[model samples]
Target: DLADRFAELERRYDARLGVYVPATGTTAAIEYRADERFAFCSTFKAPLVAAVLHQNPLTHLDKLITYTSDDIRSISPVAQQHVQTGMTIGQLCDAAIRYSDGTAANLLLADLGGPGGGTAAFTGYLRSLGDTVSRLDAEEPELNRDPPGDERDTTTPHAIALVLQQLVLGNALPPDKRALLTDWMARNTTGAKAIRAGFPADWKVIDKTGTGDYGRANDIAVVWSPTGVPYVVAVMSDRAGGGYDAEPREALLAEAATCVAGVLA
Candidate 1:
């Protein structure tokens, strides 16, 4: 009964939904994400976080690296947000994951794999997870290459669901690292507005929200109900919204969440 209600909500979003259950997990349903690819937005941060910690080759440094005006010029503001003179790599990871700070992400990307930036590092990690259907890379807006549509960082709903399963099972990062990753996800502040509304008020949902320019809205989240009901959901749309106001995106998020609640309630 609950599954049917969530399916109905997906229709309203003009999107499809997919759920993966870890204990004999399953892919609930799929819409555009499985059939068509779309931009990943800041969702790339999740993999970037993995790359950084995985490549921790440097043992110890008592000092810090200083960025001059030249360093500032070479690096984009994406690097400067949480980067003062004395910050650690872990702090940068925190900033990247918690705030979805593109600056931090880009800087770290540059540091990891060089000029194609972090693409090689990121994609390598993705492939290791057996995520075959997705393209992993940054879409340069200057080259008019923006993503999902960019042919660079595309992903299907089916692929994303698998990733979520790995996350839930602690396969993505090893037991200890996975726990740290989940802890950071718990720190996500903004995506909550849409995915966690009006459900029993005490129910917990863990998910990520994504938005892009040029007509797109995407979200991938896991919801945990009071009675241990668990599911994974992924939504993506090519219908872009206009300037400043995000009412359309928010409405879609709330609509989707409510639809799922109706299913699992």
Candidate 2:
């Protein structure tokens, strides 16, 4: 029935929805199109930051990295103002994760190669985490091309959720790295209306969002159950025929999240 239910929801909304909830104590895994490819959007920021923290000391995050006007992408609110003056690696992580700032993410992506500047290094980091399906083939705006059936910069719900669990919940990163990752993720201002909207006050969530052209919207998270237990979940979406002007279908995302909440509850 979840298969039918999710299909019905997608049909009703005229959108594609991918949902994955990993099994916990009492619940079995629930997946709908979990292996299907969807745009990565900005969700890669979570893993990108994770890789940065994994490879460097905490003090390195405080170190500033300079940028120029050429580094700016289509939507880079936080990095735009600070282009003249460099920002700490932590600031870039905060902006990329919390604000979904494209330029901020690009800066961090380019920062991953031990100052040698490797842009697509995060994709390799995902492999080290045992994730085989996700890929980040390009930089922001370009990565968000998100055309139908395109494999570039795409991730399955299961793949993304696996990476999130390992990076944020499992021991893939040191405790210090995990702590800072959680803190920055908890302060995310992007997902309030997505999966976060579906939970009651008792449930806690640290999530990352991804938005792209073609009505793509996604939220991947570690949500604490009402019992205060943690489980990883991912929901990705796209509205058929949607264009650049297409907005994230927050209400539908909320509905999908509510569906997951009930199943997990």
Candidate 3:
């Protein structure tokens, strides 16, 4: 029934909406087009930041990363303010994950030695998490492209969720590194308009979002009901009408998230 509901919503918008929720202790798994691919957008920032911290959070987080105007991106509110000085790697992670700051993302990616964290290294990072269906082909702005048939930067909802779970709860990273990520995710500012809008205000949510060409609206998150049911959820959408002015279609995501909440309890 939930899958049918998801399909109906997709038809209404002439878009594809995919979701994946892996089995938790108290609830069964659920999916709709979970295996289908969609452009990653800024959603990749979470795992990229994870990779940064995964390297050596105790010391790495304190390293001040310096950048110039040349490092600035088209949209980088957090990175701009401290351009005169520098930013701690933690600040870059916070900017990228919490604010979706593109410049912050690039700086971290460059540190990992990729144009977009370097395909070899970034994809290797994904592989380390056991991911097989995601790829980062270029840096921000470029990787955001959602042209039909171009799979340069793409990930399946299922793949992203699994990666999220591995890093967040699967003990892939040490506690210190993981705590830094969970903190930024809990305070993320970008997800308010998407999945975070679905649940009750008291429910705890940690999320990262991605938006770009097409009606691409994606959120990969970990959410918990007050009683403490946990779900690792990834939702992504792309519409027939897509581009700079394409609709965000955020309400659809909220509704989908609501549907998921209903599924557990």
Candidate 4:
């Protein structure tokens, strides 16, 4: 049943969709095109945050990180609010994850030792975690410049779901640090109509949303049933011809998530 439904959705949309629910505990229990990589966009920030936390203690997040006029750019509402002034690493992270603030992401990248160091650190962390299909090679603005449909910095559904698993249930980070990461994601308000759309209102979802030009829209999360059953879920799709409609693409994501929720429920 699950297999047919997933195949139908992919055919209907004429696009690639990847879904993974590692909480099912069996590979065949939950997966569809999980290994196909898609341009990750802001989804990359989640792992970047994890790598930053692992290398630096929690206290390291409290230090001040400045962003001057040079940092002023478009696409980040939060960063635009404080151009000349700066925010703490903690503040920048909140903006990056919570709001998908591009400027805040760049600022955090610089703090992580600039493009070279940040990418290297994030790449090493992913490799160590055994995530083979995901990468964080370019910083913001530069990454945004990639052809809208190009798969530059990308992650497959399976890789990101496992990353969340390691962050939540595995040994990637201690409980406290993991809690910090999930807290920011849970507070995200950017994608009201994405995966969470089909979730029960009482259920809890902590996730990040990524959007690129064309029709690339992605959402990944750890969702909990009202009974407190938690599972990692990732939905990624790219409209190949570009000009992706947000409503329909996001609606498809919601539908796919609900289909999985039916099994878990």
Candidate 5:
């Protein structure tokens, strides 16, 4: 049933989708075109937050960070709104997760010892979870400036689903820090029209969304069932001709989630 749904959706969109819905005892989960890697976009910021906190204590979250030229001149709405203003690391972290701000992501990456350190920490942590398929080597803005020909900060659906799983299960960060990050993602409004749009009103979804060149749209989320069970889902799409149509993709994700719900219920 899952594969049939996936195939029908893929045909409708003329795009490739990667989805991973973890199994519960009552339901057999699905993985459709999940092994292929796609540009992760800002979805990488979620793990960057975890890695930054891993290298810095929770106390450092309150430390002040100033906006720089790198942050001010970007397309990020948060950065543009807060230009020349000083904000704490925690505040910037909120902007990064809640708004998917490129400026906030770079600031956090700088705190974690720059792009190299951030990438190492993120990929290494994922590797520890048996996910060697995802890698982040470029900052958010840098990717926009100089798009790579190949191998540009890519991830498989399976990789990001596990990343959310690690965050939800407290296998990565300490419990308190994990809770903090989870709250940030739970408040994410940037993806409100995507996966969040499709979810039922009674259920809660914590997610981080990413958009990149070539019409890459991705959302990695941990969805909680009304009955208290949690499902981890990662949906990624790359539309033909690099065009973006938000409603189609969002509807697809929502429809996919319903399929998972049907199996679980």
Candidate 6:
């Protein structure tokens, strides 16, 4: 009755709808069109969050997160400007995720055991989760800031969808760990327009956004339907005028995504 009622009011949209749906027990539960690869910006944090917890069970509330000059150098200057002299690990995470504090993320990147440690651990966990497509690296270079390069981060819609399913289903981390991941994603600063903007006020979107030089704009989010149905939608687009009027462009993209949600649910 509910599905039929909603379908009577709406059908679908013409814009691109790259989707992955879960079927029966498949975990993906639904479907769409695009399944290609895209350069993932910070949305890679989906796996990153899992990796940190897998390596050490007590990542949350732990205050030993540390950093060095090397770690500091990899971070953006804008992120560095807010760094405090003496802050705890939990506080740093608040700054990084809640404030979208780049410096704070860099600090945790180090404290999770640093470049080789955390990154490597996270990768291992992802591979174990039956995800073999995405790659997470804290590698540094001004490439993201300057001319585009292939060495940047990457993920496919399918891979990300699977990761989100694992997370929401509690397979990616322990119960408490998964809860922490949800909390961190809610704190992500980048979901304002693209995936986050299309929903009604009461709808909650736990998401993250990443934009780089050129027309590189991406938004990955976990949307909660009015019925409490959860689905992961990630869109990474490269448009010619991507740099111009980002808010409007992303809003448009978010609107397209909302259309998909309406039908799938």
What lDDT does each candidate get? 0.56, 0.85, 0.85, 0.78, 0.75, 0.56
| Model 2 per-residue lDDT tens digits across residues 1-265 | 5677778878777789999888777788889889999999889989899998998888998999998998886688899989999899989998999898888888888888632244457888999999888888888788878577889889999999988998888999989889999988899999999899987769999999888877788999888977679989899998855666576687777888888887777
> For residue 157, what is the lDDT in candidate 1?
62
Cα RMSD of all models vs. native, in order, equals: 4.7, 1.8, 1.6, 2.4, 2.7, 5.9
TM-score of 2: 0.95
As for TM-score, the candidate ahead, 1 or 5, is 5
lDDT of 4 by residue, 184-261 (tens): 988987867877886878889888888765567789888888987788898887766545443227777888888887
Clashing pairs in 5: none
Summed over model 3, clashes come to 3
TM-score of each candidate?
Answer: 0.75, 0.95, 0.95, 0.90, 0.89, 0.73
lDDT (Cα, 0-100) at 7 in candidate 1: 61
Tens digits of per-residue lDDT for model 1 on 1-265?
6456546655665444433232334434433235567666666666666666556643311123343333342223334653456345665566566666555566566657654777776777777789886776563332113622457676766676577657754466667666655666657655766566635566766656555554455566666778776666665554433332322355565665566566556
lDDT of 6 by residue, 1-265 (tens): 4233223322322122234444333243444333555556555545555565656656455754445445555445434553444456666655555544555555555556645635555555678888787665653333234323343455666777777778755576888877877888787666777677767766778876655444555666777767776667766544323342222235435655566556544
After superposition, the stretches of candidate 1 with alpha carbons farther than 4 Å from their true spots are 1-33, 57-81, 139-148, 198-200, 240-248
Which of the two, 3 or 5, has more lDDT?
3
| Candidate 2 to native Cα RMSD, angstroms | 1.8
Better of 1 and 3 by TM-score: 3
Order of the predicted models by TM-score, top scorer first: 2, 3, 4, 5, 1, 6
Q: Model 4, which residues run further than 4 Å from truth?
A: 23-28, 114-117, 144-151, 243-248
lDDT of 3 by residue, 170-206 (tens): 7988887888888999999878877888878878899
* Model 5 worst lDDT window (10 residues): 141-150
